[PDB]
UniProtKB/Swiss-Prot annotation, chains A, B, C, D:
Belongs to the peptidase S12 family. It comes from the Eukaryota. Transmembrane segments: none annotated. It comes from Homo sapiens. The gene is LACTB. It is an enzyme of class 3 (hydrolase). This is Serine beta-lactamase-like protein LACTB, mitochondrial.
Length: 398, 398, 398, 398
């Protein structure tokens, strides 16, 4: 049924693997709510010659932020968390900040879309200001290779609380991870329980059993190794790192199946609202339809790094549908997030299917494609390959 | 036929054994009423270099409660026992109890689901009260290492009969073992025959030949040895213990085939009703379907320790199947009981198969999977391994 | 080289095994200081079908007295122990005992040959008196089945310290085991260290690398089971017992090679004195010849139970050499000790070779035969079989 | 040819592995200069299910001292090193030290046999002094979990240079690893080349191609993982550590074939002296016989921790050949060194064969047994197992 798109997808995977040089890569493609392809090429452990399998466990670096949003959404739906109020209500430990001698409010909504003025692994404000001015017209950092073990989010707040702001909140978009550490602290304070157990409950609800936080001591089966090329153009192991300070922003281990399930749940929650009118035998989504349409609504004055046409909206990169000129390029609406860490690259992409008159009456949610790719290599851009694979699978729907 | 599934299961057995440090482990799997795999890994007797075999005899700790429950169900079907009436009807030797100076009644139905006020190896009321209060928001005990031999069931009642109750009956779930000793006294009084003799007949009916109570003087072939780790992390023998005071609670020795037979009989008795209508050539089950449905009917205000999703139902752990949201986790119905004795651990799991229109018309009972695992290592959790093995075998049904 | 004697002794082994139905038996025969035969017939573990082998470990009951005697003799040679001083000098915990209102003295020498008034598993002052009078003219005791664990010897002395003397010390022979507990306490006092670690050093000196004390907790490889026959004439297991209160008297584990080595050392120490003048390159024995000749010197008014011809001589049974009439029975000089415990029986026998003027000049010690037999059946007499095997192997000396 | 020996050796290995619950174990045996058995039992990588093979690379902790002794002996034979002069000739950075205000000399010979006053992972002088005084009548220390990287030995000396001595040099034995760090510094100074380059030259000369220093970045094929048991008696991973500060003392990775080759070279160097008269076509040893006899000569007032009978002799444990009494224990001459690291244990043993006049003319060196055992479990003593395996292989010599 899908014997043609599989070969093209494998060819594209070989293309990207050969161009980059990654020792291993794993892909998972799910169509219409069911997993239809899982593949792994290369070695998960070069030293011991362990081949890549669909149950290989790797690092999802920036995709974790998306998961955080879900938790926040749940805390929003119960009404326990309000986006408008300043963040000092929940966490007094965060000092009151001032910009150019005036009071400026820092809110949860600003943190979610990276509209505050928190820094991102950089301290020289002049370089950041010059970069932003040039734009208007990162692996060399030392904080990336921290080794200290932090007990909780409060202990990790000390890394950036004393630094001054870089821009007036709500005015300039600056991608940063410490804002999501603050978000995790807010989640801990508002929920009343620890962040890790809340995330574990969410994982249990969504049926993502393999997902877990990265730690050295526990024994985690099928854990992959991470590699990088050195100055002499030779493969070597990345330095040992500890990610206990950025749980919500950069630390989580998972396979492709869990990401496929997460994408399918998001797609069903998004699309069930339209089908609800036709039939009443459909189960409710995980989140309310208003929350789901709030997540994927682009926020103005934002940039999305991995494709120029997109905009950033609630830990997601959303590309809308438009055709400004006749017989010209027709943009396809989709939502993707890309993650990169020390010796690890990943992409999660959701391509919803456009709905017609008969589709809403006859078909059943979900209707779309989810593509997840993970490789144990550093500084690899996987968005375009995922988009091409999704389009290839979408071409021959039936 | 079942090559891949068997290989996967073997790896899972190795993984649990390696992490725990268990010297030996035995597994048995039954599919649709026939035995498809039995295996043993390691040594049953470390000192004499005796390997583990599918016919190794080991301890079962809390699975004896299932057999006592089967005896009680047979007596109830025969009409000689009433669940509602107070236990003073059968055993007057149990003193009348008075909680907070008010009259309370102790009934068999309460003892069955651990909802009475009987203690469990703990004699300080304040510790239990504070633990239960915290819960609202045992291998160190001396009674577990008794050596005195008890001739009959009435003698063993003096351990706990004089002690007061801990909670009001029917309000708090307190997992206890002495309740089943009192149940054994009830069975002995009502049936007119000794508990061991009646249980021998019940075992004979089910073809459970190797099952027998644990005693020192008789010669029992293929008996395994039980071990534990000391403060220096070196394997050692457990102390000599006399389990005669809890015959109905934890004093039986059995192989994996006997547990497979018991599980298959339970599954057939559960499932015969649906197939009875289509085909009239089927033999009656060991118990009536009205008793079998009550057997696996979860009770409110009860907790299943080995899985947070299930509840307690007539000396069993039951996990009902439900799906709250679309594209989200769906539970699968199964019944499991786990036991942990001094030096041994065991698990028995029954996974019934959902039935469709085609299956009912043509196929015959029983339809399901029964998995039994035993290891001679103390404090080992095995329920998850059994569930994973059962799910692995389920996929390659045809 | 010994083909005839091997078969002729295997015949006697089968005879003695069939006569009592012992499940297993092990024999070791050494001639001229070299182990020439080691055999095992039957099953060491009936339940798990473990065949007997020469490295099987079984209980030795009264040979522990012969082992403690080496420690006592070594302490005496070191000058730290005095045989004639009252034992109250070493152990004041023992009270001053009085016989019929007259002062009496208890010494080490009286305790060596059971000439004191210490009782033995019998608490009736009268019951033993008529038995002793009839003689002049104990498996049913509960003391043999004690389960308490004793940490040090002084605690273990509490079982008999308050009881009065049965006879005037030094006048009546009464085989007792508590006297050797008192001797172990005396060794504790004089040596200044523990009893068990002193015997460990002695065993290490003699190359007996598998002679350890019997405890349940440690893992002991190749350990064997012990059986008995009940009133219905069926094979059953002996009850679990603890021998911690009679380490020096009735509790140790060993193989047959250890007993062979111990006997070889004793024989060499007994015989090197004569060969000393012939050759000066002979190493000294573990004990001086003056101590060895006193070791095997019979004591008046002492009875050797397992052979009516001999007498008791410093924890050994010795039969001398004599010929009263011409062409009549000619006694042979030999030393043997027999041990019987709960579920096991054993014998060790040393038969020295008569030497002429030629052999002393031409031969090198040791010159004799050592035979050790152990069977796991309660209350079996084994002295006669050992003596007959020793004579058969003496027949084919070279 | 060695089937019985192989079977018996396999069983012993099984017993130790079961006792300590080691995930994996590798053994290598060389008989008379040839390798006859190389076996692996268990898993090298528990997480990824990688079985142990002879070509597994594990940690050697204390054998690196035995490897550094070869470099020191080679330098001594070259005439570029003096054992008597104080070390400050080569390393002025090490300060002159005072014990109770009297001049003391720190020489190479004292540090070779751990006779100086240098400490070992312990800073409290009072505790060490009390322990030594008690004896007259290390995996919990923080320094063992260092993560800092040291470029060269000169800066690595800063950890202990300012700490005064604990005992007067040449008077008390104190096992330490920092003394060999100073020895590595002395080797760097006197050789005129870097320590690691000289060690690589030696490894190339001895055909030990797989022996390399432990570095995280380089890709080392067949590298294993190292495990421990936590408080909950569950298998976990050891923390990340760095051993760059004790290159010569505790950091090196090697297989079992390399250790067998090293032992063969040492044995040939030790035994080539006797056979030189019988045949003149034998190649010279790696070291002069006068060097080898000095190396394996026990030093007075030194204690061998893993064997009470032997004594420490120039980075080795040597047991003397002696027999005090007749028909008693006869000691056997052998050299053994045991190394324990964080999550790894290893042992290397050499057993020479006693030679007579008729053996020299016909046989050729080497004549002995070399046994190497490596396991990835923390704090395992493998000396006795290696000795038993060596003796079992010695019984079936021809």
């Amino acid at each position: 049924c899908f014997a043609r798109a599989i070969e093209s997808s494998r060819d594209l995977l070989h293309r990207i693997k050969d161009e980059v040089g990654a020792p291993g890569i794993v892909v998972g493609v799910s169509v219409d709510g069911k997993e239809v392809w899982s593949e792994g090429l290369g070695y998960a452990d070069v030293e011991n010659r362990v081949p890549c399998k669909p149950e290989t466990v790797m690092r999802i670096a920036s995709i974790s932020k998306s998961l955080t949003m879900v938790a926040l959404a749940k805390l929003w739906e119960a009404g326990k968390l309000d986006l408008d109020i300043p963040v000092q209500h929940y966490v007094p430990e965060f000092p009151e900040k001032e910009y150019e001698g005036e009071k400026v409010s820092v809110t949860t909504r600003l943190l979610i879309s990276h509209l505050s003025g928190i820094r991102h692994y950089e301290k020289d404000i002049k370089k950041v200001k010059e970069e932003k001015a040039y734009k208007a017209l990162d692996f060399e950092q030392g904080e990336l290779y921290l080794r200290e073990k932090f007990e909780n989010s409060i202990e990790s707040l000390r890394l950036f609380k004393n630094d001054p702001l870089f821009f007036k909140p709500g005015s300039q978009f600056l991608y940063s991870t410490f804002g999501y550490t603050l978000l995790a602290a807010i989640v801990e304070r508002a929920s009343g329980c620890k962040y890790l157990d809340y995330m574990q409950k969410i994982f249990h609800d969504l049926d993502m059993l393999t997902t877990v936080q990265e730690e050295n001591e526990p024994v985690i089966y099928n854990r992959a190794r991470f590699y990088v090329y050195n100055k002499k153009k030779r493969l070597v192991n990345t330095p040992y790192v500890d990610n206990s300070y950025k749980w919500a922003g950069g630390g989580f281990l998972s396979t492709v199946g869990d990401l496929l399930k997460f994408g399918n749940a998001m797609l069903y929650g998004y699309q069930v609202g339209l089908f609800k009118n036709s039939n009443e035998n459909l189960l409710p989504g995980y989140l309310k339809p208003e929350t789901m349409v709030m997540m994927w609504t682009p926020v103005p004055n934002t940039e999305m790094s991995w494709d120029k046409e997109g905009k950033y909206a609630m830990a997601w990169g959303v590309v809308e549908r438009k055709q400004t000129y006749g017989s010209c390029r027709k943009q396809r609406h989709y939502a993707s997030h890309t993650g990169g860490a020390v010796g690890a690259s990943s992409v999660l992409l959701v391509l919803p299917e456009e709905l017609d008159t008969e589709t809403i009456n006859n078909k059943v949610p979900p209707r779309g494609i989810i593509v997840s790719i993970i490789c144990n290599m550093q500084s690899v851009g996987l968005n375009s390959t995922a988009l091409k694979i999704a389009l290839e699978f979408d071409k021959d729907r039936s």
